[PDB]
Amino acid sequence: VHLTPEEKSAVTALWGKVNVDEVGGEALGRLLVVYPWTQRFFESFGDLSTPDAVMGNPKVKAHGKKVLGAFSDGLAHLDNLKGTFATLSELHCDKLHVDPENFRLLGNVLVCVLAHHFGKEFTPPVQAAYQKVVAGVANALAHKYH
């Protein structure tokens, strides 16, 4: 993925403020609430039966934190997303059989959560840079399908 140096600084500056305890769990939680069929991949996470239950679920928060850390690792290796995510792509494609459209949905849910947390700081140019990142992450996740 090609960010301009101006885009890279804006992305990096925003990401450095991200609440790593909550943002990932809110993104995974919203995925589970807005696209309920994704709950089928998380049968062992306990109570997913209501929106409040999903968002407050400690297993959702803990797993979302891992998601966010995967995005953080992608941000730090934009030149080699395919190799950064090869292990995760094997997991999500060969083992879990996640439909790659869901990779895209989760990336866009993350964008909504960033907009939600940062308000007007999440400008259209900042979003545009983040859309290049999440498209790049989602494609790397899907590589073992290609």
Binding site: V54, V111, G119
Partner: protein, 141 residues
Amino acid sequence: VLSPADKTNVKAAWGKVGAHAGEYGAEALERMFLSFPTTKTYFPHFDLSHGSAQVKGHGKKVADALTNAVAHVDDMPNALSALSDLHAHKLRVDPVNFKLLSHCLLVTLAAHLPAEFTPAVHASLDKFLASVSTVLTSKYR
């Protein structure tokens, strides 16, 4: 298909736009044009520079149509028939672009209305925009 709760979620959240209709619609279009440059090819006759007056005025038309859709949430095919004629019959917009604009509208709402944009309301808004999108990409006359 929208539940009774979906409908009241949408009316409450979209009702907060108010006098920000043009600002928010224009912002959603700007986010779309900047994040997904291929969508610009439907507007080749437009001035699409940032802050363009044409984009601002167009953003208001979009917002107001959504307001009308919210008011006619139980009979959208009837209320939106003129817009379907434009987007499905004449412009032949690929449905993927409706997903892009819907996403950018959600982003705009999250950025401006954080108290409104709860997980359940986010879910209802997504279903609402998807249903609007289906009407505008369907040829049903």
